[PDB]
Amino acid sequence: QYVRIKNWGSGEILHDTLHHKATSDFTCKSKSCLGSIMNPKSLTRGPRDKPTPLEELLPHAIEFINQYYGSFKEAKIEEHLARLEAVTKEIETTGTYQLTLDELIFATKMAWRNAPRCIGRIQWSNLQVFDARNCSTAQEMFQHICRHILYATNNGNIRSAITVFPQRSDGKHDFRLWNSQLIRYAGYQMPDGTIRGDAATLEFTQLCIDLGWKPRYGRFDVLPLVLQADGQDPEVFEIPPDLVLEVTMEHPKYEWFQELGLKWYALPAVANMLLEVGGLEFPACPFNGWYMGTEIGVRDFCDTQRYNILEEVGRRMGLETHTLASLWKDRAVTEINVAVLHSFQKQNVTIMDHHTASESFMKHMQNEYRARGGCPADWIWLVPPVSGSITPVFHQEMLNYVLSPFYYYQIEPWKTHIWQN
Amino acid sequence: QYVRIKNWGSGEILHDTLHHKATSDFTCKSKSCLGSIMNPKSLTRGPRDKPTPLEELLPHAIEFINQYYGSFKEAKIEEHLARLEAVTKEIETTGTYQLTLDELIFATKMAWRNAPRCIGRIQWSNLQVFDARNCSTAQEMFQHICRHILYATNNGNIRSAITVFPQRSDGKHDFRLWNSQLIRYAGYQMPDGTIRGDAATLEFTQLCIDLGWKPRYGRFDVLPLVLQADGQDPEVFEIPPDLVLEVTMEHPKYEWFQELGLKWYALPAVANMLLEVGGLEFPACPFNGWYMGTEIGVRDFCDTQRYNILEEVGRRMGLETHTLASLWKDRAVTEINVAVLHSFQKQNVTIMDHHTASESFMKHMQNEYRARGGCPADWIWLVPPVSGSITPVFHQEMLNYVLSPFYYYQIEPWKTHIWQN
Ligand code: HEM
Ligand code: HEM
Ligand SMILES: NC1=N[C@H](COc2ccc3c(c2)CNCC3)COc2ccsc21
Ligand SMILES: NC1=N[C@H](COc2ccc3c(c2)CNCC3)COc2ccsc21
Ligand SMILES: C[C@H](O)[C@H](O)[C@@H]1CNc2nc(N)[nH]c(=O)c2N1
Ligand SMILES: C[C@H](O)[C@H](O)[C@@H]1CNc2nc(N)[nH]c(=O)c2N1
Structure with missing residues (x-):
């Protein structure tokens, strides 16, 4: 019926029923818990080489559509029924379907709302959506991204935004940002053997260099954007310095x-995750908050x-x-x-x-249980890296599950990419 | 074959195979993780009203015996075989069996070694064992406990020790310490409505009072020992003040x-957990470290x-x-x-x-993987309540499973006790 959850700081009890809508398997086995694993398969959605089987797509499409129209305070069964039929027909005639901007906006927010590792979800409904699903070249990807960065930075008054590139078709024409974050510093191994900059980006920095990027050997060199458009080899684009605050x-x-x-x-800003919604997959959809x-x-x-x-x-x-x-x-x-x-x-x-932020999340979690009887939460990621028990989130029991829409991790692009040249 | 584990601070990889020896189910389902649940059934071993079915006991007994003799650097197959037979016969003739002091010592240390939530396990082989399996009355329980406290305190030079009372027989004659810890402060709700002392022990303090204990209304009043011997109603025993450093x-x-x-x-010192080993259950076995x-x-x-x-x-x-x-x-x-x-x-x-302590545990965990390809660990409990990522344990991926011997939680005694009067 419901999973009982308790906050040991207040003694308050919550009943979780939302987990029933959870997807397939998830990290942990039965005899063992794998909760502290950073990149478990359960949170990863890999590459494809063929379209999505219609037997799988249709059901998911119908489910999403039902969720979308179900979210309205004042239902619209006629539109709901019309859309259901239109999606089916599109799937039969094209072997897939396109979401309306409205449904896309809904999906990006729900996916955020469903991010177990995000502590800033009380802001979930405040998200600017940039529709780049008609993007075609890397150059265009670069332009869209520069526009996203500019908009989001807003001279210091940060605004949450997400840019959605074309959805995965056959899996051979994926749009992908090879970077992990839109803005990240390079790391270099100097001649004297010491490491300069962000030691964690040593390999990726070398990759950018291998692709032609000019290393600057600084401690805070903004890495270039490595953009893969329509399944083609990635192209390096330096980020215009004026855009980096x-x-x-x-x-x-x-x-x-x-x-x-x-x-x-x-x-x-996360640059390498995938947005999954109604059976569709968006391998390129950078998003940011503050x-x-x-x-x-x-x-x-x-x-x-x-x-x-x-x-x-x-x-x-x-x-x-x-x-x-x-x-x-x-x-x-x-x-x-x-x-x-x-x-x-x-x-x-x-x-x-x-x-x-912790108090903020607590208010959110409480709003969520009230709103839909649950809130997927990953305690391990939600508890800050310092002063754990000093934050209220530490004393809150949580259930971590994968709903849909959702933001998944992906396999490093350079591991599966098929180079054209 | 093995579960891959990674430390993101050093990049080091470890292969876990020990989880294969894990017991039944454990907290997490399949579609959802319940890792942040404080008292999940998977970590609790409740009460019984009948002896343990021989079909279950025998197999476990054999397993433990094999583990015990397997731990010797220089095997002793003759003793091993002899013991195997002796245990079986005892089980057939008595419907249970008694461990040798040696096996008990081994079991208490292994159980400690197997405590997923303990960060001080590098000390696992350093444990004094007090055999009180012949205890009969509450008064005797009290004396054994006072001796344990005195020994362990050692005027400030703390020593790890555990006192083992009689194992569960039919489940109707359980020895139990109703306290959570041997030493804990009382909490009272004053007339003016404020709380004095340890707010978390308000209920238990009231219980001690209901049982005749005299409240002292102080901020740091050491609670009395509430001892249940041989299934009989608990008796209150004040801890001699000289023993509380x-x-x-x-x-x-x-x-x-x-x-x-x-x-x-x-x-x-933990006073309310249960030691499980070779099919046997010890509902009363207080233990301490520092x-x-x-x-x-x-x-x-x-x-x-x-x-x-x-x-x-x-x-x-x-x-x-x-x-x-x-x-x-x-x-x-x-x-x-x-x-x-x-x-x-x-x-x-x-x-x-x-x-x-964190560095200490890291060394231990590494000794364990080297020693037996694994170390049951609960990240959520191992990471200190402050400065999380500043400790090395925070960057270490871990697998949490339940082996045997093991220390389990129990259902609060006052919830299942059958009062005699
Ligand atoms: C409005 C401000 C926001 C704040 C303050 C916030 C904060 C955070 C923080 C502190 C983390 C931990 C990251 C880490 O430890 O590396 C996180 C993770 C996450 N956030 Fe939020 N967030 C916000 C907005 C958003 C938005 C707009 C989205 C998406 C539309 C989002 C999606 C996620 C996801 C998917 C993760 C997991 C990232 C990963 O697995 O590496 N967040 N967020
Ligand atoms: C030698 C010093 C030791 C240190 C420094 C140490 C430290 C700790 C700490 C910090 C915790 C967390 C407790 C909490 O958050 O409430 C813990 C838990 C635990 N320790 Fe150790 N420990 C030591 C010895 C032992 C010994 C001797 C045993 C048993 C023979 C043991 C069994 C456990 C168990 C079962 C838990 C889980 C307790 C629970 O679930 O509430 N520890 N220990
Ligand atoms: N506040 C956030 N933090 C992160 C993304 O930002 C970064 C930036 C740099 C680095 C990381 C993450 C990961 N560690 C290495 C360096 C996770 O996702 C989001 C999404 C919206 S706001 C937000
Ligand atoms: N260092 C340890 N810490 C704990 C037990 O001690 C206490 C004392 C008081 C309280 C708790 C635990 C739990 N929170 C409420 C008050 C867990 O178990 C052990 C076992 C050996 S050393 C040890
Ligand atoms: C091994 C462990 O899972 C990894 O260190 C952790 C724990 N929690 C985190 N929590 C957040 N928010 N971000 C993180 O990178 C990590 N990494
Ligand atoms: C809800 C959460 O599981 C509970 O607050 C936590 C997390 N970790 C802990 N870690 C330790 N060591 N001791 C604890 O009491 C708790 N409680």
Whole structure:
């Protein structure tokens, strides 16, 4: 009937029934849980070489259409019935179908609403949709993307947006962004053997270089867009610098913080995921929202395999960086998080602290259970990378399932691509 | 063949094969993950009213015996074969069997080694075992427990120990400790409506009172031991105060911290779990190790439903406790964690910071994969309640499964107990 869920901070109980609408299998087996796996098959939708079998497509198409018309406060059975028939006919005559802009807008928001790992979902209905389903070349992809970046950045007043490129046809003409994020810094292995920039993008940086991109050997070089249009080999496009808004990192007290020469970009945008809806698949649909402070202050700056600045900040603060029990790491990361927030704020760039975001998500989750008896949530991703139990989300039990529409991961494009030359 | 596991901080890969030895089902379904559920049935072993069916017991008994003799570096097939036969005969003639002290010692350590939620498992082979399987009355239970507490506390130099009471027979003569922990503070609802003490023990405190315990209405009143022996109604036993070592909370810089009038006990001991081994069940087997600083500094002191001192410390530090984005909560909890560590250290009481414990667990996990191709681990419990990604455990993918021997949760005793009077 329903899965009982409890919040141990308030004692409040919630009943989940939405999980019944969950899709196929999902990560965990029976005798073992695989909850902490970053990229499980259950969250990945791979490549195809043939259209989607009609026996599978039709049912899903009907389901989505029913969900769409069911969302209206004041039903429209005539339109609903008409659309149902039109979709079927289109599927029979073309072997697939096109969504209306309206249905697409609905699908992108629902997919967001259904993202288990997203803590900013209280904003789910506030999303600008750019329809690029008529895109044809890489150059056009590049133009659409530049327009998306410009719109979303809005000189610091960040706006959530998503650009939808052509849906997968036979799977041999996929539109794909080989980048992970629209804006990301390069990483290089210098002659002296040290790593400069974002150590996590060493391979991808080399790929861009192999494709002709000119390496700049800087600590914060914005990687180029690697765009694959209509199944053709990817083409490199440098992002126009004017479109990349950045924030110089400063601390409200430590004047030496700026001396670290750090900065980060204002726009967090996923470039490599796939939108699944009503049987259709969109391999190219970059989307963005705004940053949560910890992503930069904690992961980007403090992960040992990223910029790894924790120790340096420790010494600057003159802490016992040689004695773990001193908890110097905790004191350092806090000042770094303060720097990030202080800087975005001073430069008028939208950002949200993890505390405010956690409370925000709690309100959302409660709205969702009230609205539809459930909220797919991945505790492991929702709990911030610092001060876990200090946030309310930590004490909230959650159920993680895959609904539809949904945003899936994909297999790295360079692993399955069939080069033309 | 094996489940691939990855550490994204080092890129290291591990192959898990041990999960094949996992037991029945476990929390997660197929279409949904229930990883963040605190007390799932998969981790609970409830009450019985009849002995264990021989068809089930024998197989498990044989399995355990094989595991025990298999653990020796220099095998002893003759003893192994002899024991196998002796156990079978005992099962046929008595309908159950008794473990040797040696096998029991092995079982308690393996069960610990198999605790997915324990971060201190690198110490798994260092455990003192107290055999109280011949215990008969509550008074004797009380004496054994006092001896355990005294031994473990060791004037601050904490030692890990476990006391094993009689195994479950027909399920109608269960030995049970109604407390959750051996040492825990009471919580009271005062006449003025405020809560004093540990708000989380309000109900259990009332229960002790209902059973005759005299409430002291203090902020740190050690709850009495509620002991159920041989299936009989529980009897209340106050813990002799000399046996409870406590640490007064002080901060190395903030002289006003001591003014908060806080303290905590030195001994963390689970009192209500069940030890399962070779088909046998031990409903009463309290065990202890030593504290990890965050348990007290973060959960006990900062959980809103516990002592909830975060805001007060915030004001004392003169922080913008009215502006979440100031990250005052992060600064407060850090100083509290420093206080806890500083105090235990100053009073010579064993304790370990969460950073040192995380690295310690990483070494353990690596020893385990090398030793037996696996390590049941619950990411959600292993990652400290503060500074998550700052610890290495956060970047380590893990598989959570239930092996055997194992420590299970139980249904609250007052929910199934059949009162004699
Ligand atoms: C409005 C502001 C938003 C905020 C503050 C927010 C914040 C976050 C954060 C902190 C994460 C964790 C990312 C990581 O750990 O790498 C995340 C993940 C995610 N978000 Fe949101 N989000 C927002 C908007 C959106 C929008 C507009 C979409 C899509 C339409 C979306 C889709 C997702 C998805 C799919 C993930 C998972 C990403 C992955 O698996 O790597 N979010 N978000
Ligand atoms: C030697 C020092 C040890 C340390 C530092 C340690 C630390 C911890 C910590 C921090 C937790 C989390 C508890 C919570 O969040 O409430 C935990 C859980 C656990 N530990 Fe250990 N532990 C140690 C020894 C042991 C021993 C001796 C046993 C048993 C023989 C054991 C069994 C467990 C079990 C079963 C859990 C799960 C408890 C639950 O589900 O509530 N640990 N331990
Ligand atoms: N706030 C968000 N954060 C992320 C995407 O942004 C980035 C930017 C850089 C990096 C990552 C993610 C992943 N770690 C390596 C570097 C996840 O998805 C979304 C979607 C809308 S807002 C948003
Ligand atoms: N270090 C440990 N911590 C815990 C048990 O100790 C306590 C003490 C008090 C409280 C809890 C746990 C649970 N939260 C409420 C109050 C879990 O189990 C063990 C086992 C050996 S060491 C150990
Ligand atoms: C192994 C683990 O799954 C991985 O480190 C984690 C946990 N949670 C996360 N949570 C978020 N939000 N983003 C993340 O990258 C990760 N990675
Ligand atoms: C809902 C969630 O499962 C519960 O808050 C958590 C997460 N992890 C924990 N981790 C530990 N070690 N101890 C805990 O009590 C909890 N509770």
